[PDB]
Each structure stands twice: as structure tokens, then as C-alpha cells.
């Protein structure tokens, strides 16, 4: 609704200095011909100068020169606030000097060569910031701002000196540019970076709204997570897009020094920081400066915690000073600094998925020329352990396995450097294929929490079983109203038992992938671990990652493997406790209803697990997971064949009611045979073909009619001889023993 | 502050710890206040720079000093109190310790009042609910609460229309009001609890809550009521009241909620430690933590110390005869060390609960400890009537039902299996209702009608259907043939 706020479209005059009119507008405006109109946009930074050489073009989209795109804005859709401010003083002149380009080549004077013939009668216009191109030759080249006489903008005049000595210099500039673009020079930490946005950008654009009231911003961020996961981009991305002047402090420097001088190197920052408020401080790797009391032995280690402490708590008058801190996990510093006051929020960055690799690697090949067969799809699947700069290293690898394969020795002497050969090679699927495969050892071996892909069609009936997870699941999060109202608590856990391979892990994905919310697994080996490590405190960690990333389903299975490993399934002397589900136990009892956490738990020896954890606020729900059916085993048939070329003579139908009893397992196994046997089949054909024309007096002969493109009935049958049952009927009894059992058994 | 000293140098650090004593000292009546002083002084086990060891002393010296001169007081806070060296908790240093805690429903409801008072609040508040849903939080997370809620309305706003329209001014900026929806957004979404150690606090059951029982109650006002109401007419005669009653039954009956229920009454705190924590302190074999408990009750006298599932160490080793070894272990040794040394006028009363007190060690119910036992048997038609009722009195039911037929319909059931039973008809009619809802808005938004609002709610209330329905499920839970164990180890006593 405001007048003066419209979009800004393509410019054909080459010359920055010339900003458009709209004459309705004009009509609007009180825009007169002259100096300068302060045209206003994005970051503080303008592009103002002489005025009205537009019109060409329709109206509501001002003409701005492009190279006011890139400053003073990021794209097009952007939005100008002209407001004339002509009649600027005229002090000595504006700097002249370049910045890249004209070293390359005769320098001179840099003024009086190329410059010289554009300040004619239009005696600069400008404001500091305004970047464009000037020259008297290949007429591209930038003009960039150096000095300031006058801190306003002016109208140069002639008789004033100027002074090139200054030297052209590299991109700091346009680092600064590339920093400035921010939110569009990351992915896979689409949540974390709303967050942020939410948490920072009120405090820091409008201040004014906070002075007027009494109301408590943040003055201390904590982000934990692996390296390598743009942390210190993040908050010069932050910092950036609102404005916010942005200072950076490393641990290294600090513990680098003597102790008088690294003590006194602290306060610098912070008396360089209240100056140039609203600002940001960035301190990064605190693990090296403030470790805990076991890490830290020596006198000049804690007078250097200290001092941090008391410099923290001098801000409690100032709001518009903000402290951000990087480390890996939160257990690794001092307490005092996570407190009520100092370090209160916190943030996990965590590690990206499918997307946000893809993201990365297609801002990371943005300017990698690819010719073709890069999907960046499949790449993205295989990379499985890999964060932020290791994908980079990937795009340069295989990068130089396009030129260091073949153009080892073309390059030597034949030619100096050229584009001409640097722009025409390009990067195949084979480099990546080499490098992902080759030299790629993940970093990562920490646990995930993300939503899964497998949808419920990949499993096979259990009608009733999926209505029942909708109705435990799904159904709280949408009417908790109707659940108070009744005067109702949810339960909050479930346990499955049945016999192996009979698909209950899928299920615990499948709800997830439904109810859009993040999962953790957790395998028995690893409760055996902290059975024999003697280790339940990760227990707590563990809950802690299903507290931070609600809502979310946490999954158990192998539950029985600590009382199988003590004994059998009576055991020693000893009861049915230990040392690692008293814990669990003592962590499900301190948890709210809220945050939307459900627990599952996976078995298939119910008689030997302890029977206080079947209490309620515990697992109290029980589910079977009974064998398939013949018209269920027709469906898993369909689900594992579904992803091969497995068009046949034989009906999977024919195949089900032969088997009897045969679990999940056995029918993925089938199928793995079978096609085992076509592919072996497929290679000893190749082998064959190939030999025999060559070894052969042929030659050249041609024939490549694929002779195993599908698997037909004949591998199919020869793999039914190699596959029986793999359970017992005693194993059915005694689950429908516990079935009956159950009945009065609470 | 202590950081404030410890960032500086030894000259300067012990020269302001004496300029402020002397500062204080002038402008008398004063108050001296330190913070942090686990900081400053722990204990020496922690301490290795001998400048640390030299900035004790200066202040044992200043404490000593302080009582010759002047009225200068000195107030200090801790988080715990052995975090710090010995040294000070003596007569003329820090004689006196207290307590602060953590609020109850009453203290968080009243923090949120006074961080409310010049906040605008529409009708829907409803504090008590947030503050019975507040639980584990502290004043600053309840001022962090307050302030999220108000900048979640407050961001959606402002985003949305007037960065444009004018200058804000007072008008709107107070225009705005706030909404419960804002408090549940704030309380779901950013709940970080500070709060997993102990309780102590007076709980909310009552008599009526319990169904029947009332010789047990009876039996058990003699032993509390009286002590603390009538002293001089047990010192007239020659009896010296007990400290400790036991309480052996089937689960599912109520033991755990007479030990609140007492409390209740006599409007006295309660504390309850659970199995876990035992089965905790024995694996990590520290028993020292038990005298931290009793210290506790000790500073939160008139208190009830509650201990169930007290067989759980005896069942872990070995089943009821358990292994080789005898009926003692490294927890109940403390135990009775910590309970023969405590004074009767602390008046701190003892409750212990179990199921098999077959395999309790005999040295705990000798005369001094546990020496009162009481059987808690299972309900009967006219209990069984009164816990329906009890559970029952909080949600909305028709009146075709016929409570009198379903009790007499059970047998040898618990309290438990009746709750359940009642859980699952809440729940069918929750189903019935939801897919009712589900079904009616679906159907209809095919149906272009504008208006086609027959608004009834589907179920208020359940009928015998329901509960006919969950009756199949509803069975017994313990067996005949423990109930006999039981009443065989009550009349062989
Ligand atoms: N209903 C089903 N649909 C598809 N696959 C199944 C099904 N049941 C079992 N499976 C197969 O069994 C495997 C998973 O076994 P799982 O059920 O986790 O064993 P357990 O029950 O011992 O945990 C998967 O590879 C899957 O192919
Ligand atoms: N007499 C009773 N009156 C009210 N509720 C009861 C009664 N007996 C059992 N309950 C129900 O049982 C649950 C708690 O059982 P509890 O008495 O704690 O187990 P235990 O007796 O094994 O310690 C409560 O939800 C309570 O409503």
C-alpha cells in the first residue's frame, strides 16, 4: 500500500549514475532533475545519483541499472523506496580509483586514462556503495568506494585533487556480497535457520518496539553440533541480511597469547562491539577457551572463565548486543555458562538429509559446467555419513579426475593457459562414481533423527493394526480438546512381540512417514554395549535427542537381549532386572505427556522381559504381529518384486498358497536368489560373447539382443528348491499360548 | 560476585574482599550479600593453586573479625550445601542454613500473577490449568514463558500489517491483547524444564478419594493425629509413640495413596522414594545418598517419608529365597544406621509398603523400626461401588448405567482393573466421536451447502453399551492363590 514501494525490472543504459522515472509517479513523487535521488532498499546500502533518463519502459516497474541488483539488493520481485534528496553539498570530489580489473594492463594513473572521460557534466551523483561500470576500453570494470572527505555524499568538481596511489585489490568485496546473500548460499538446515530468523531479527531491525516496553530478548546463543556443518556462515548470513554489524572471535588467539595480553584481548571485542550497535560476537570452538573443571588444570585457565563470566553479565542494560557460541555437544563446557541470563537458548544444526545434500550440491556445482548424465539425485542417496564441506571436496575431486585423467599431458607445453579448453571440458558420472567410491571415509558416525521414506503400501494387511497406530498416534495431535474433554491421559507407549522377520520395523517408519515427524532407532548391540561398558548414562542422551526434535516416534528393539545374554530365558539366580532397563524405567517416569514423544518397543520373548515395565505410564498396550497371510504374502511379494524387471511365465498368486507359514524374511530371500541366478546367468552369456568372436578369426561381429532382460519362471523355480520355512510350529504355540495367557493375566 | 574476584590477581582480589568488608562495615546497619561461593571457596580436594587456598583464608579471617564490630550481617547462597568446605558451616561463620526449594501449584500460579500485572490477558487465560501443566518449572522459566506468549502475538502482528501504515504508537502497541492458545504454543514448544531432582509438598488427595477403608484410617490418625495434637497426655501416662508403620497386600489397592492422603489431612509434607532410585543407589553402590534424603525431612519437619516396592532388592538377587547369600544387603543396612539415630521430636513419620514381606529381612520389623503392620485387602462390593464412583466423578456419564450390577458382577478385582475399564469406554467414545466428526464434515463438503449446520454433539455422555463392550476385556488380575498366601501369612503372625 505504500506509494513509493514498487518493483524494479530490467535497464538498458549501461551507466549506474542514470536511475529512471515513472511519470505517474513522478507526479507522485516531487522528483526533479539534478543531483541525486535517494533511491532506498535492502541492507542500508542505495544507488543514488542523476535522475529521469527513463520512461522507455511501462510503468510500476522502475528501470534500476542491474548492477543495483547485486547491491543495495539480491534479485528481481525487489522493491525500491525512491525519495528524492537533491542538492547534496559539494566537498572536495569523490575517491577515483579501481578495485580488480585494472591492474591487468597499463595502470598510468588509473584516473586519467579510462575514468577521466565520464565525469563530464555530470559531476558524480553518487553514494558510497554505489558499484557500476566505467571505463575507456573493454568497458568492463568497477568503481568502488575507498575514501571519505566528506562523509555525505557529494558533487564533484574540477581543480579538486585525487590520488590513485591506492592499489586495485581482490573480491573482499564481493565476499562481503556473497555473505550478504545469506539464506541462499546454504541448505538442509531449513528449520534451525527459521528459528534463528524468529529469535533475532525483532530485537536487531526495530529496536524502538523493545525500548517501549519492559520484555526480555536473548543475549546468549549456543549452537552444538559436528564440524564442518556452517556455523560461522550461518551467523555471518545472519548478520548480513538485517544489517547487523558482525564481529569474530577464535579460542586459538586467545589461548595463544600471555595472560595479561589474552586476558585483555577479551574486553577489546566487546568495547569494539557496543560502538557499532545493533552487533553481533561470534565466538567459535569455546570448547578451547571454557572446558569443564576436568579439562581445565591450571590457575590462568580459570581466570580466563571468570572474566568471561562478569563480561556477560555487563549486558543486562544493553539489549542490542547478541553473543552466539559454536561448540559440538552441550555437556562439554562449564555450566555457569548455561544459566538464565548468559548462554539460555540453545540450538542442535544436527546433520542434513537427501535434500539438503542435493541443495549443497547444487549450490556447490552452480558454476561446475556438467554436460551430462548428472542426476545429483541418486548422489545424494549413496552419500550416507557426509556434511557440508566433505560433499565440496567431492566436487573438486571429481573435478580433477575429469583433467588429471587425460590431460595430464596435454597441458604440459602444447599450450599456455586458455579458457577455451578450461570451459569445453566438462564432468561426467564416472568422476563421481570414482570419487564417492575411491576416496570419500564419512566423519560421521553419530546417531540420525529424520523422517523416513517407507509408506505404508510397502507393507502387506494389518488393517486393523495400522487404524490402531492412527488412533494412538495420530489422533491426540489433532483433538487434543477432544481428549481433555473427556477428562482423558493418552498413553504414551506400545510394544509389539511376534515372531522374527515378521515386519515390525517397518512399521514404526511407516508411522512416522504418515504423521511427519522424525524417528530414532536404537539396536540391541548397543544396549549390550552400556550393559558391558557399564554406561547408562548415554541413556539420558539419548532421551535428550527425542526431546529437542518433537514431535518424534523413539523405537526399542532386541529388548530382550540383556536377559537372554545372563543365562537363558530364566537366567542365573538373578531376577528379570538390570543395571540398563532401571533406567530407561527411571527416564519414561520423568517425562511430561506433552511434546508429542511416543515410545515403541520390539521383542519376541515377552515371558523372560521384566513385567514392571508393562505398568501403566509404561509400555501398557500389547500388539501381536502374527505370521502373514497367503492373500498377505501375495502383497509382500508384490512390494519386494515391485523395484526389478520380474515379468514372467509364473504367478506370484501360484506362489503364495504353496507357501505355509513362510515369515516376511523368507520372501525377500526368494527373490535375491532368483535374480542372483539371472545376473550370473547374464554374465557367463557376456563372458562367452565376448571371447568367442575375438578369439575366434571374426573380426567383428555384432549382437546384443539382451538375453536375460527379466526374470522368467525358470530361475523362479530353480530358486523354490533352495528356500524352506525358517520357524516352528512350537514357536506358534507358545505365541498363542501368551495370547490366550493374557486373558486375566493383568 | 565471585567471577568478578577470581578474574583479577592476587593484590587486587584480596584487597577488594577487604574494602568492601570495611565499606560495609561504615555504613552500618548493612548486608552483605555473596553469590556464587562454590566459585570461591570449595573443598580443598578441588583446589590446587595455592592462591586459591589463600583467598579461604582471608575470608575465614573477615568472619572472625565480624563479630567484634559492628552490626554487619553476611548472606550467602549456595546450590547445595557439602558443594563447599566444612570449614564455614561452624559457630561465628555460617551458623545458620535454609532452604528454598521449588514453588507448588499455589507459588507458580502466584509468580504468574506477578509477572502478568501490566500485560493485557483476554478471558481464556485460565492460569490454574498452566500451572498444574507447569510442573519441574522455576520463576525465570515462568518469565521466559510469560515473554515468548506475548512476542508470538506480538511477531505475527507487527509482521503482518504496520511496518508500513505509521509510526507505532502507544495506541496499538497496547491495542494487542494475549491468548491461551499463545501460552500452550509457548509451554508445547519451548519446555525446557529445569527441574528432574526430588519433591517435597503437601499433595491434594483426600479421604473421599480413597473407597472405604475407614478402620485403617481410623488406626491411622491414633498414630499421627494424636502425637503432634496431644503430647502431654502421652507424657502423663508411660508410652512412647512409634515412628514407623509397613503396609503388606496385592497391588492395585491404594498403599501409595493413604501415605498422601495422611498428609492431606494433617496438612503435612510428603516425600516418596520409588524402586528405580533403590535399584540405582545398588548398582552404583552409593548408599551414601540415603543420608542426603533424611537431611531433607529433617529441615521439612512435620513430613511423611514414604518407601515403596521395598522387596525389589530381594527379588533381584535370586527369586524369593534369592542366591546363596542371606536376606541383608549393602541399602537396608543404611537404613536402619540412619533410622536408630534419629531423635523422636523431629517427629518425622516412616511408611513402608510391599507384597511379599515374606522375604523382608526380619531385622527391619524388630521393636524401633516398622513395628506396626496393616493389611490392605482387596476391595469388596461396597468399596468396589465407592471407587467407581471416585474414578468416575470427573467425567460425564449418562444414567442408564446400573453401578451397583457391574460391581457386584466383579470378583477379586483391584482398584486398577476398574480405571482401566473406565479408560477404555472413555476411549470407545472418544473413537465413536471422532469418526462421527470426521465422517459428518467429510460427507457434506461435497455437498455445496453454505449453511447445513445440524450441530449436536454425537455422545456427551456413555450408556451400558460401552461399558457391556469393555466388560469383555475387564478380568481379573490377581490370583486366588495369592490372595490365600496372603491371608495365611496373616494368621500365622
Ligand atoms: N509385511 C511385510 N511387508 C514387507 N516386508 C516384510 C514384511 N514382514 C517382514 N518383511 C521383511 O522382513 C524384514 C524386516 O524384518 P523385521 O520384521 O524387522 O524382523 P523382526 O520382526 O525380528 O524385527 C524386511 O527386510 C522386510 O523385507
Ligand atoms: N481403594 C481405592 N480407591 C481409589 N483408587 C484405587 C483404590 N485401589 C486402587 N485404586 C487405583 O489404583 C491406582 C493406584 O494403585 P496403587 O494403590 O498405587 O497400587 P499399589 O496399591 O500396588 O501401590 C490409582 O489410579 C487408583 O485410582
Not at 280 to 301: C, M, N, Q, S, Y
Request: proline fraction near 5%; glycine fraction near 6%.
Amino acid at each position: 500500500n505504500r506509494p513509493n514501494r514498487l518493483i524494479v525490472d530490467e535497464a538498458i543504459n549501461e551507466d549506474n549514475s542514470v536511475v529512471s522515472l515513472s511519470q505517474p509517479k513522478m507526479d507522485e513523487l516531487q522528483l526533479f532533475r539534478g543531483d541525486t535521488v535517494l533511491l532506498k532498499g535492502k541492507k542500508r546500502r542505495e544507488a543514488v545519483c542523476i535522475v529521469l533518463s527513463d520512461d522507455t519502459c511501462s510503468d510500476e516497474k522502475i528501470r534500476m541499472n542491474r548492477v543495483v541488483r547485486n547491491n543495495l539488493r539480491v534479485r528481481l520481485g525487489d522493491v525500491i523506496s525512491i525519495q528524492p534528496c537533491p542538492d547534496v553539498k559539494y566537498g572536495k570530489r569523490i575517491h577515483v580509483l579501481p578495485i580488480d580489473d585494472t591492474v591487468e594492463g597499463i595502470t598510468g594513473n588509473l584516473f586519467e586514462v579510462y575514468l577521466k572521460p565520464y565525469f563530464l557534466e555530470a559531476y558524480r551523483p553518487i553514494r558510497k556503495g554505489d558499484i557500476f561500470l566505467v571505463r575507456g576500453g573493454m568497458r568492463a570494470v568497477e568503481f568502488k568506494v575507498v575514501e571519505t572527505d566528506p562523509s555525505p555524499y557529494c558533487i564533484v568538481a574540477p581543480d579538486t585533487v585525487i590520488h590513485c596511489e591506492g592499489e586495485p585489490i581482490k573480491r573482499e568485496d564481493e565476499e562481503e556480497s556473497l555473505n550478504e546473500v545469506g539464506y541462499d548460499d546454504i541448505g538442509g538446515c531449513r528449520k534451525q535457520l527459521a528459528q534463528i530468523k524468529e529469535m533475532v531479527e525483532l530485537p536487531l531491525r526495530h529496536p524502538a518496539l523493545f525500548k517501549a516496553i519492559g520484555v526480555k530478548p536473548p543475549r546468549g546463543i549456543l549452537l552444538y553440533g559436528p564440524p564442518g556443518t556452517g556455523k560461522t556462515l550461518i551467523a555471518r548470513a545472519v548478520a548480513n541480511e538485517t544489517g547487523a554489524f558482525f564481529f569474530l572471535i577464535n579460542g586459538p588467539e586467545i589461548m595463544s597469547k600471555l595472560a595479561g595480553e589474552s586476558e585483555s584481548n577479551l574486553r577489546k571485542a566487546f568495547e569494539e562491539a557496543e560502538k557499532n550497535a545493533p552487533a553481533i560476537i561470534f565466538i567459535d570452538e569455546l570448547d578451547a577457551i571454557a572446558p569443564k573443571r576436568e579439562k581445565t588444570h591450571g590457575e590462568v585457565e580459570r581466570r580466563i572463565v571468570s572474566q568471561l563470566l562478569t563480561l556477560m553479565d555487563g549486558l543486562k542494560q544493553r539489549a542490542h548486543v547478541i553473543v552466539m557460541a559454536a561448540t559440538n555437544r552441550p555437556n562439554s563446557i562449564d555450566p555457569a555458562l548455561r544459566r538464565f541470563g548468559r548462554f539460555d537458548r540453545e540450538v542442535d544444526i544436527g546433520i542434513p538429509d537427501a535434500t539438503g545434500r542435493l541443495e549443497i550440491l547444487q549450490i556447490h556445482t552452480k558454476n561446475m559446467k556438467l554436460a551430462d548424465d548428472v542426476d545429483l539425485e541418486q548422489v545424494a542417496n549413496e552419500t550416507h555419513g557426509h556434511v557440508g564441506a566433505d560433499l565440496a571436496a567431492l566436487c573438486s575431486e571429481a573435478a580433477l579426475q575429469a583433467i588429471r585423467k587425460k590431460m595430464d599431458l596435454i597441458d604440459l607445453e602444447d599450450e599456455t593457459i586458455d579458457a577455451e579448453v578450461m570451459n569445453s571440458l566438462a564432468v561426467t558420472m564416472d568422476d563421481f562414481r570414482w570419487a564417492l567410491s575411491q576416496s570419500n571415509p564419512s566423519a560421521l558416525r553419530e546417531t540420525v533423527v529424520e523422517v523416513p521414506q517407507v509408506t505404508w503400501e510397502d507393507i502387506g494387511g494389518l488393517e486393523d493394526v495400522k487404524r490402531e497406530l492412527q488412533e494412538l498416534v495420530q489422533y491426540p495431535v489433532e483433538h487434543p480438546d477432544k481428549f481433555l474433554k473427556f477428562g482423558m491421559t493418552p498413553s504414551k507407549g506400545v510394544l509389539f512381540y511376534g515372531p522374527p522377520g515378521c515386519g515390525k520395523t517397518l512399521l514404526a517408519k511407516a508411522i512416522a512417514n504418515e504423521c511427519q515427524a522424525n524417528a530414532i532407532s536404537i539396536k540391541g548391540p548397543e544396549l549390550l554395549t552400556m550393559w558391558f561398558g557399564e554406561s547408562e548414562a548415554n541413556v539420558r542422551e539419548i532421551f535428550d535427542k527425542a526431546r529437542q526434535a518433537a514431535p518424534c516416534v523413539l523405537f526399542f528393539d532386541e529388548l530382550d537381549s540383556i536377559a537372554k545374554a545372563r543365562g537363558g530365558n530364566i537366567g542365573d539366580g538373578g531376577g528379570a532386572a538390570d543395571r540398563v532397563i532401571n533406567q530407561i524405567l527411571t527416564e519414561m517416569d520423568g517425562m511430561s505427556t506433552k511434546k508429542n514423544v511416543f515410545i515403541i518397543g520390539a521383542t519376541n520373548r515377552p515371558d523372560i522381559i521384566d513385567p514392571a515395565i508393562l505398568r501403566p505410564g509404561r509400555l501398557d498396550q500389547l500388539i501381536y504381529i502374527p505370521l502373514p497371510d497367503e492373500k498377505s504374502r501375495v502383497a509382500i511379494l508384490k512390494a519386494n518384486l515391485r523395484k526389478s524387471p520380474v515379468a514372467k511365465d509364473v504367478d506370484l498368486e501360484f506362489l503364495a498358497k504353496m507357501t505355509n507359514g513362510f515369515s516376511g524374511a523368507d520372501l525377500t530371500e526368494i527373490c535375491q536368489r532368483a535374480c542372483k541366478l539371472a545376473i550370473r546367468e547374464s554374465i557367463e552369456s557376456e563372458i562367452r560373447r565376448e571371447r568367442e568372436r575375438q578369439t575366434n578369426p571374426s573380426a567383428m561381429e555384432v549382437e546384443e539382443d539382451d538375453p536375460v532382460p527379466e526374470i522368467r519362471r525358470d530361475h523362479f523355480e530353480e530358486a523354490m528348491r533352495f528356500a524352506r520355512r525358517s520357524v516352528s510350529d512350537n514357536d506358534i504355540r507358545k505365541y498363542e499360548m501368551f495370547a490366550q495367557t493374557l486373558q486375566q493375566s493383568r
